[PDB]
Nucleic acid binder design. Structure first.
Ligand code: 1N7
Ligand code: MG
Lengths: 66, 1316, 552
DNA sequence: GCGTCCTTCGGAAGAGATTCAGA
DNA sequence: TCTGAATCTCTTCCAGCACACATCAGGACGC
RNA sequence: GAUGUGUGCU
């Protein structure tokens, strides 16, 4: 479902900011997950350009740079 | 006839059916409940007398001493209402209650006392209520809203459906006390009875059964009936009750007295039962295997050895019956556990019950209530006795006991406030019966199960808490007392009572800040029934049936007046005729109907007495005698209406207005509006701000006068007489000799309340509506309050509207307003607002208010005086200095930006200890002069009146008028008269004159002391200067205007006069609305109001034309009589032949602006009468006239609707909503811009607005939205420098709120970090 | 934060930290004095409870409260929930260079323009005014320019006009449901305090003018300005992102103007005349020699791009009206004449804009939308399309349909009480019969409304579609439908409770006659259902879109 | 006046703990 | 009498923006 | 800064 498919993503930041912050952060801390800042909510929270529109070219340049 | 407040402009009424009961006092709930709370009750039923007796007498821990109550007295308030509002202290009266401390003699529990001493100890201070139902708590006026909560008692709810996910409907019974703990019983999906105290956890109800000291045999005796098995020669026959064979299957061949009645496997119908009854038999044969499915009630012990064979509540079998046969117990008793009717719920509860006796049940109850502690016997017994069997920890009120004893169908309604064993037993029995099928649940939304807790009861409850805390302190202290030295004041602490009462009246969910921006707002705030608050339901845990309008709301709660938004249906409004029962329930008047006659005796029927009779409806025709003109009249019998005969009815509604509230009954043609539009119209009519000149509604309802008079804003005369002297600030009434008392007669002065600030920064200002030397009766208005016109609620202006599209300037909902409307200042409003400049003695030295301001020129200091404050009358604008305050190193009080004004008042409060400033001294001197002058002036006025009365008594019994004038007025009381009782009257009047002189002197001294007082303030403030501005907000494009039918609108253009459409007479149209707003939202009442206002203004135009050229009184009288005779069959019936040919000239002058029309709520005018009234003038009957274009000069090619609609001005002013913010002030924890308009704050670009920028793909815009003008700090200033550098480029960093998030995660045991 | 006086603010984290430190210090002291075992174990338990209350308060048995029985927020209550550092300060923030005011129409505008109040744009574009004041040399520092802007001198307004020229601002309404709730307009400075909003984008914003406010946001950087001009511009937002239908559709007044214009009645000031073009039709209408609803023959040159982008003219002589010929003067070249030669409603001109965009492009579509709005407002003003009380014509056979249905319901009651149907089927059959009766009454009143225009053909009587105002604004799709118009002159019908159940009894009166003291009470059930449904069940539809956005 | 201090009550859904039953 | 199915119990969620007002912030007891 | 109440548009 749209709740489980959003709470079970690979980025713990999106899941924590969506719902069940305590339960998401507990699992992330136990499992030692490492977020890659791949979505749009993650870059909004961090404070970067979203990899969606005019920032998509910049994010492609940054990804292929390294 | 008509009084002089009615024979000055008499409103034409279209009401067809007469009214047999006038509208009662509107704010009569607050005034009655607080009167019950505040007055002396010798019996002690309700009020403070019932709160002291509920606690006092208070004794020690059997320490041979007692403290007991005697009487209480309320002293005069320290300041009156006006002075309390000026200063800012609670309008309260000290509570002086006479206590009496008695300690007995030693070795004498009932003997004499060592001493008896008594004094009145000051404990607490209860705020008094004004004459309008408003409380002055901290200078601001508060209104304590009534509360609609569940009545105490027993309610059998359902919990139907969604539980257990199998469809099985459970059953629960809740015993709600007024004070105490709940006693929830409920059923199990396996049909068990679980009690639940305070909703903690389930355990079997048989635990409470044994806790009530009941044995299992007694329990089975209570909840079951016995069936007897007897030991005989053989076959072990059973006693038979033929009714027990109703609806089951015969397990074998039923026979009695030999012959077989019912064969094996047959059904036992009613015929078989009746035939067995006619057989008159009692005994039948029964196989031994049939008793295998039975349960023994009473335990059986051996007759030989005494050992128990079978205990109580256990199944039987063949071996058990064999062991019983050899014992010798000739009688066997079992339980009649029917499968459908007499379910064995108690037996299953006992089987699942783990406890065995009273002690173990008490232990289990104690473990449930207080876990984590080893239970002992005495503590558990004390707890269970304190739960529902003590008057101190549990109390069903009188209404609670009434509901409890009426729900269980008992006879007597009085009883003990505590629960008893019988009450619990009957509650469980009724729950079991409801489970069986006999009886039914009751709905919570029924108005017969919901009370009203008004101001008095709620205030009394908190006083009880304060007294409980005080008596707990006394209990702690009374055993440690040093006797013979304890006055009845050393143990009474006034802090708990005062703290509790202040906590209730100041900071509560029902001590609401009064919504006061017209009389309607306050009269509907006082008459508000809020389901929220303490003891009520929260907004989140509110179902969709509580919000809904119940059928029992008819006549008790308005259906159409409830606020939109989060709480709709929880804030119900009281009806016009609704009252409060002696217990608290709502009731409505009804005309009692005999066999065929509708009498005039009104009975107030509650919400539970209404469902028994069949009640007719208000719009049922009668013919001069109380007989229904038709055979079948539409009536509502039991929550469901249908046609009933004229003989079955026994009640009838008083009027069509009794279902709607006082706010929804001011909407003309309410029966034509959609009820959503009715709700919006009621709310907007509550929101209207009073304009500059009040203007009556041409189309009204007849309840405008009732709201105007009963709100309290109008100075209504107390005793009738002749206006002796009318000034712009006072009215003096020469009382008639008929109503003048023999002693202390004098006259009465009405001091009007001039321009002053209300709660919503509006201007409430009374002005006289009477003339000099004009006769006034009792209870007629003298001064029109805010938005009042000759004692008639006038919240707006009669606007000449046209419904037509005009070049898109009324596109969606906008209004196009002519320039003449703003030229005439029709919608111009006064907005008096105050500004405070507190001077707090901070560190580095205190502050000052000196007139020299550093780094500021003399341009801003020109308006300031030498003392630093601004002159009264200065036309200050935004940004000017009002009070020049300097902190120890400039923080002077400035006018907020964007508002002009005019300083009309300056008040300086100085802490006692700061000497003074010369402006404070000037204000004090002027106030002293005014306070002496007013007292001297009132003494002179009612002393000239007293001397006039002395002369009027002197004329009887030998008067000499020639010597009276030349004699000085000092010696006028002992002049020529005999020694009869008239001389006694003269002596009494002389003594009254001397007493008035002395009272004036002493009150002058008191006023001098009060003005020269200290007026202590908050800790750490030196002096406060409150400057009152007075803005005149003219109308402008942007501010909301609305009608009375929920047709809102924001003005889009102030069009010139020559551009507005005009008719063939050249008259411009003031307002052009949009036609398409009418069909979509079915507010057709605005079109009918437009047509009726057109007719009213046509009548007014005809009167004005007949009056402009001076015609004889005959023609005016003829035409006005024609206008007042129009109608089918009206109740008005006004004859102008009784007018004195000059009272009709005043009427004609008042009608030249347009004849006011009364159009009752559901008994209004019809279209035939509207068309006939249009015919009475010269206007077309269709309501539509020909309008030509204002600018192009060519006609609109269709007739358009033109008429006078009563437009309001809602106080959603555009200049109070416009806001802008560049780089300004930021928050503290997260470096974000602040939020709000009072604070300089930026609009929130919320979560839903970020998805809108993500959808476009705007990534740079979003990035600058959340970093550069947001949480980020260094980039925020770099961007500002770039913007003022000619370069629009950003260098964003990281938002500060993300670092806050990282630190807050790290503050837990979680380690979050950014990798490289 | 120090308040007024010597007191301090009531912080929750500080209170929790003080409790934890008190318990920890007490345990540390008891661990050195060798306290009895029960006391030290109880103190350790209290320390555990204090730490649990500090980390996540309320997850244990009872949440500790600070004052007057309210649970103080722990280190988790300020990171989770709707009021935490995730949904309140990171996914959406407060912004500088922002404003807020009510909105008015101002229909003189264009699709790329809005009206900023003159005193609001001065406070929004304040650093931009500072920059140009320092550039032009009227000020030497930032404080001199700040004081000059504060004083609002005569030169500041010219600087504001220069800096506001091509700097688009973002107008956002409070519920930003879809992406068309944020759009960029080129400001047009106005005197006032209300933000004039173009009437075409009101459908996209879902913004009427009855007291609602919109927020202004100023794009700062060059990239932000170009994103507002190329992506968020209201000119580039003429199609809904959900479906390809146009979203800047004329609504409720322009459609009424275009429906009164493009219409015909069988008579005129001049009907048999034949014209030489649309200019002749406009000249005849303005001079008053021909009604707007004539049936004349105009000679019209329509273009067509059936070739590879070449507009080939084809002049003919078509049977049109004067109003349609006048409207043809604004239709851009390339569109067939068989789109205005009919009675234009709302769907018709929505289709006209859609085909204009699909054939011609974006710029002709925007210019066409502006011209359509102008000529709809003008010819709706020039008609006086009012609404009276005689326009809601009651049918003369409604009570016969009422009597038939009440007889049917009486027969249903007699069948139910006998035992033919249960109490769950009587409900359904009575709802069905009353809904059929309501539809029959609606059909009767609609037939009595739509065609009730008996007018001579200059000879004998003839029938035509009615010019009744209620029917005009119902058929044109301006504002209304069969339901709302039916409730005015037909019968209101039967209501629905908040739970969803339909009322057993129907209302047999309309909003032109009165309503009973009881029929209004019955209607209040549905009226309160309608108002409770929004405020209490749009939460579980905003939740749906929130957890749809957060999953995709 | 300063000043140190130690109630209960919605409601649908989902997950994870018991607990049943049934072969 | 072991293991899926059912039931019980605990948990988390319940739209957006904005405006106005008041009240709190330790209050008890020692000094 | 948080609560409590009222309110505006959806
Ligand atoms: C005797 C009088 C009616 C006269 C017959 C009875 C009937 C209902 C009783 C009040 C209600 O219970 C509510 C409230 C409960 C509080 O606990 C104590 C005060 C209140 C006001 C009660 C006082 C009094 O007892 C009342 C008025
Ligand atoms: Mg709106």
């Amino acid at each position: 479902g749209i709740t489980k498919a959003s709470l079970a993503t690979e980025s713990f930041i999106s899941a924590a900011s969506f719902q069940e912050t305590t339960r998401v952060l507990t699992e992330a801390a136990v499992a030692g997950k490492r977020d890659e800042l791949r979505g749009l909510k993650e870059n909004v929270i961090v404070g970067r350009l979203i990899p969606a529109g005019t920032g998509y070219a910049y994010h492609q340049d940054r990804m292929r740079r390294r | 006839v008509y009084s002089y407040t009615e024979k000055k402009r008499i409103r034409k009424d279209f009401g067809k059916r007469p009214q047999v009961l006038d509208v009662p006092y509107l704010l009569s709930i607050q005034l009655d409940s607080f009167q019950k709370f505040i007055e002396q009750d010798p019996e002690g039923q309700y009020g403070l007398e019932a709160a002291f007796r509920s606690v006092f007498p208070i004794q020690s821990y059997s320490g041979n001493s007692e403290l007991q109550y005697v009487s209480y007295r309320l002293g005069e308030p320290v300041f009156d209402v006006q002075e309390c509002q000026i200063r800012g202290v609670t309008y309260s009266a000290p509570l002086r209650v006479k206590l009496r401390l008695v300690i007995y003699e030693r070795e004498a529990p009932e003997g004499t006392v060592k001493d008896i001493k008594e004094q009145e100890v000051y404990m607490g201070e209860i705020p008094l209520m004004t004459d309008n139902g408003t409380f002055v708590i901290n200078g601001t006026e508060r209104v304590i809203v009534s509360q609609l909560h569940r009545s105490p008692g027993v309610f059998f709810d359902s919990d139907k459906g969604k539980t257990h996910s199998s469809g099985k409907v459970l059953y629960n019974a809740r015993i709600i006390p007024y004070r105490g703990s709940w006693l929830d019983f409920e059923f199990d999906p396996k049909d068990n009875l679980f009690v639940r105290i305070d909703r903690r956890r389930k355990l079997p109800a048989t635990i409470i059964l044994r806790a009530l000291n009941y044995t299992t045999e007694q329990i089975l005796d209570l909840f079951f009936e016995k069936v007897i098995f007897e030991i005989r020669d053989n076959k072990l026959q059973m006693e038979l009750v033929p009714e027990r064979l109703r609806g089951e299957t015969a397990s074998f061949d039923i026979e009695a007295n030999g012959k077989v009645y019912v064969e094996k496997g047959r059904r036992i119908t009613a015929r078989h039962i009746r035939q067995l009854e006619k057989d008159d038999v009692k005994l039948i044969e029964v196989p031994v295997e049939y008793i295998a499915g039975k349960v023994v009630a009473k335990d059986y012990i051996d007759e030989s050895t005494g050992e128990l064979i079978c205990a109580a509540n256990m199944e039987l079998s063949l071996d058990l019956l064999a062991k019983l046969s050899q014992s010798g117990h000739k009688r066997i008793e079992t339980l009649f556990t029917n499968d459908l009717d007499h379910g064995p719920y108690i037996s299953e509860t006992l089987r699942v019950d783990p406890t065995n006796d009273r002690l173990s049940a008490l232990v289990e109850i104690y473990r449930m209530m207080r876990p984590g502690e080893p239970p002992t016997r005495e503590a558990a017994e004390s707890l269970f006795e304190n739960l529902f069997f003590s008057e101190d920890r549990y109390d069903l009120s009188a209404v609670g006991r009434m509901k409890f004893n009426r729900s269980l169908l008992r006879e007597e309604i009085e009883g003990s406030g505590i629960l008893s064993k019988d009450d619990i037993i009957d509650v469980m029995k009724k729950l079991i019966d409801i489970r069986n099928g006999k009886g039914e649940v009751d709905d919570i939304d029924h108005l017969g199960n919901r009370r009203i807790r008004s101001v008095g009861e709620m205030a009394e409850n908190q006083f009880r808490v304060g007294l409980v805390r005080v008596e707990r302190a006394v209990k702690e202290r009374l055993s440690l007392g040093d006797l013979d030295t304890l006055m009845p004041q050393d143990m009474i602490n006034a802090k708990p009572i005062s703290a509790a009462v202040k906590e209730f009246f100041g900071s509560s969910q029902l001590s609401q800040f009064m919504d006061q921006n017209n009389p309607l707002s306050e009269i509907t705030h006082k008459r508000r029934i809020s389901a929220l608050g303490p003891g009520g339901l929260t907004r989140e845990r509110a179902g969709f049936e509580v919000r809904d309008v119940h059928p029992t709301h008819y006549g008790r709660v308005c259906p159409i007046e409830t606020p939109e938004g989060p709480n709709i249906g929880l804030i119900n409004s009281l009806s016009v005729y609704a009252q409060t029962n002696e217990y608290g329930f709502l009731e409505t008047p009804y005309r009692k109907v005999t066999d065929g006659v509708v009498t005039d005796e009104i009975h107030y029927l509650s919400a539970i007495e209404e469902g028994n009779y069949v009640i007719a409806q208000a719009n049922s025709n009668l013919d001069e005698e109380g007989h229904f003109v038709e055979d079948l009249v539409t009536c509502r019998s039991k929550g469901e209406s249908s046609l009933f005969s004229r003989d079955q009815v026994d009640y009838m509604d008083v009027s069509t207005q009794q279902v709607v509230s006082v706010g929804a009954s001011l909407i003309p043609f309410l029966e034509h509006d959609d009820a959503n539009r009715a709700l919006m119209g009621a709310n907007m009519q509550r929101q209207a701000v009073p304009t500059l000149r009040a203007d009556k509604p041409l189309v009204g309802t007849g309840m405008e006068r009732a709201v105007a008079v009963d709100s309290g804003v109008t100075a209504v005369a107390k005793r009738g007489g002749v206006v002796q002297y009318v000034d712009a600030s006072r009215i003096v009434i020469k009382v008639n000799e008929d109503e003048m008392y023999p002693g202390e007669a004098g006259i009465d002065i009405y001091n009007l309340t001039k321009y002053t600030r209300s709660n919503q920064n509006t201007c409430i200002n009374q002005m006289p509506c009477v003339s000099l030397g004009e006769p006034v009766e009792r209870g007629d208005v003298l001064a029109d309050g805010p938005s009042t016109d000759l004692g008639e609620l006038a919240l707006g202006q009669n606007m000449r509207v046209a419904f037509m599209p005009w070049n898109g300037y009324n596109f969606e909902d906008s209004i196009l307003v002519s320039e003449r409307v703003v030229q005439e200042d029709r919608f111009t409003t006064i907005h008096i607002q105050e500004l405070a400049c507190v001077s707090r003695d901070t560190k580095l030295g205190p502050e000052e208010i000196t007139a020299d301001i550093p780094n500021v020129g003399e341009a801003a200091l020109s308006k300031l005086d030498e003392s630093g404050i601004v002159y009264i009358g200065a036309e200050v604008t935004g940004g000017d200095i009002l009070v020049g305050k300097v902190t120890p190193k400039d923080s002077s009080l400035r006018v907020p930006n964007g508002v002009s004004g005019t300083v009309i008042d300056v008040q300086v409060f100085t802490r006692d200890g700061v000497e003074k400033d010369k402006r404070a001294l000037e204000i004090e001197e002027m106030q002293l002069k005014q306070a002496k002058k007013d007292l001297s002036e009132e003494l002179q006025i009612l002393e000239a009146g007293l001397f006039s009365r002395i002369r009027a008594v002197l004329v009887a019994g030998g008067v000499e008028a020639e010597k009276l004038d030349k004699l000085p007025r000092d010696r006028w009381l002992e002049l020529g008269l005999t020694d009869e009782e008239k001389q006694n009257q003269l002596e009494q009047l002389a003594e009254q004159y001397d007493e008035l002189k002395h009272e004036f002197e002493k009150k002058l001294e008191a006023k001098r002391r009060k003005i020269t007082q200290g007026d202590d303030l908050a800790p750490g403030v030196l002096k406060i200067v409150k400057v009152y501005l007075a803005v005149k907000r003219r109308i402008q494009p942007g501010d909301k205007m609305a009608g009375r039918h929920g047709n809102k609108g924001v003005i889009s253009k102030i069009n010139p006069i020559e551009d507005m459409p005009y008719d063939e007479n050249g008259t411009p149209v003031d307002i052009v609305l949009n036609p398409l707003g009418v069909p979509s939202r079915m507010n057709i009442g605005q079109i009918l109001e437009t047509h009726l206002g057109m007719a009213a203004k046509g009548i007014g135009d005809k009167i004005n034309a007949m009056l402009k050229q001076q015609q004889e009184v005959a023609k005016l009288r003829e035409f006005i009589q024609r206008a007042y005779d129009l109608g089918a069959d009206v109740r008005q019936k006004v004859d102008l032949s009784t007018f004195s040919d000059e009272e009709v000239m005043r009427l004609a002058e008042n009608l030249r602006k347009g004849m006011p029309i009364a159009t009752p709520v559901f008994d209004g005018a019809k279209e035939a009468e509207i068309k006939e009234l249009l015919k009475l003038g010269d206007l077309p009957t269709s309501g539509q006239i020909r309008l030509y274009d204002g600018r192009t000069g060519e006609q609109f090619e269709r007739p358009v609707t033109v008429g006078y609609m009563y437009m309001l001005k809602l106080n959603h002013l555009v200049d109070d909503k416009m806001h802008a913010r560049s780089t300004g002030s930021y928050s503290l924890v997260t470096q974000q811009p602040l939020g709000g308009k009072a604070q300089f704050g930026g609009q929130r670009f919320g979560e839903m607005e970020v998805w809108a920028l993500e959808a476009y793909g705007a990534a740079y815009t979003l990035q600058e939205m959340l970093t550069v003008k947001s949480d980020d700090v260094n980039g925020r200033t770099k961007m500002y420098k770039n913007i003022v550098d000619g370069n629009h480029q950003m260098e964003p960093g990281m938002p500060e709120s993300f670092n806050v998030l990282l630190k807050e995660i790290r503050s837990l045991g979680i380690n979050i970090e950014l990798e490289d | 934060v120090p308040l007024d006086g010597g007191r301090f603010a009531t912080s929750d984290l500080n209170d929790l930290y003080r409790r934890v430190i008190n318990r920890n210090n007490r345990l540390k002291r008891l661990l050195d004095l060798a306290a009895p075992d029960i006391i030290v174990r109880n103190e350790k338990r209290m320390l555990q409870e204090a730490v649990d209350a500090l980390l996540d308060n309320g997850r244990r048995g009872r949440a500790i409260t600070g004052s007057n029985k309210r649970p103080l927020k722990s280190l988790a209550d300020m990171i989770k929930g709707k009021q935490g550092r995730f949904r309140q300060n990171l996914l959406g923030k407060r912004v500088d260079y922002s404003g807020r005011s009510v909105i008015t129409v101002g229909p003189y505008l264009r699709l790329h323009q809005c009206g900023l109040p003159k005193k609001m744009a001065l406070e929004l574009f304040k650093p931009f005014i500072y920059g140009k004041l320092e550039l032009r040399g009227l000020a030497t520092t930032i404080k001199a320019a700040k004081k000059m802007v504060e004083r609002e001198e005569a030169v500041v307004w010219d600087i504001l006009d220069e800096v506001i020229r091509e700097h688009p601002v973002l107008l956002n309404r409070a519920p930003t449901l879809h992406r068309l709730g944020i759009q960029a307009f080129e400001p047009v400075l106005i005197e006032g305090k209300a933000i004039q909003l173009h009437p075409l984008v009101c459908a996209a914003y879902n913004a009427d003018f009855d007291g609602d406010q919109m927020a202004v946001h100023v794009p700062l950087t060059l990239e932000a300005q170009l994103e507002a001009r190329a992506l968020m511009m209201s000119t580039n937002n003429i199609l809904s992102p959900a479906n390809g239908e146009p979203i800047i559709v004329p609504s409720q007044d322009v459609v009424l103007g275009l429906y009164y214009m493009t219409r015909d009645c069988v008579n005129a000031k001049g009907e048999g005349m034949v014209l030489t073009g649309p200019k002749e039709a406009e000249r005849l209408y303005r001079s008053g020699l021909a009604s707007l609803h004539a049936r004349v023959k105009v000679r019209i040159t329509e273009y067509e791009k059936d070739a590879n982008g070449e507009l080939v003219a084809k002049t003919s002589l078509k049977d049109t009206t004067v109003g349609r010929a006048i409207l043809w003067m604004i239709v851009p070249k390339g569109l067939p004449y068989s789109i205005v030669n009919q009675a234009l409603g709302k769907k018709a001109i929505s289709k006209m804009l859609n085909t204009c965009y699909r054939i011609l492009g974006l710029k002709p579509t925007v210019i066409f939308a502006d011209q359509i709005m102008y000529t709809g407002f003008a010819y709706a003003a020039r008609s006086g399309a009012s609404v009276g009380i005689d326009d809601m014509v009651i049918p003369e056979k409604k009570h016969e349909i009422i009597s038939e249905a009440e007889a049917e319901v009486a027969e249903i009651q007699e069948q139910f009480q006998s035992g033919l149907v249960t109490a769950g089927e009587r409900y359904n059959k009575v709802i069905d019969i009353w809904a059929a009766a309501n539809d029959r009454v609606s059909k009767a009143m609609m037939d009595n409304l739509q065609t009730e225009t008996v007018i001579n053909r200059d000879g004998q009587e003839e029938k035509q579609v009615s010019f009744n105002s209620i029917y005009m604004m119902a058929d044109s799709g301006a504002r209304g439908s069969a339901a709302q118009i039916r409730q005015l002159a037909g019968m209101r019908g039967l209501m629905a409770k908040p739970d969803g159940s339909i009322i057993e009894t129907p209302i047999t009166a309309n909003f032109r006659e009165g309503l009973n003291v009881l029929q209004y009470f019955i209607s209040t059930h549905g009226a309160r259902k309608g108002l409770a449904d929004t405020a209490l069940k749009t939460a579980n539809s905003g939740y749906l879109t929130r957890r749809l956005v957060d999953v995709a």
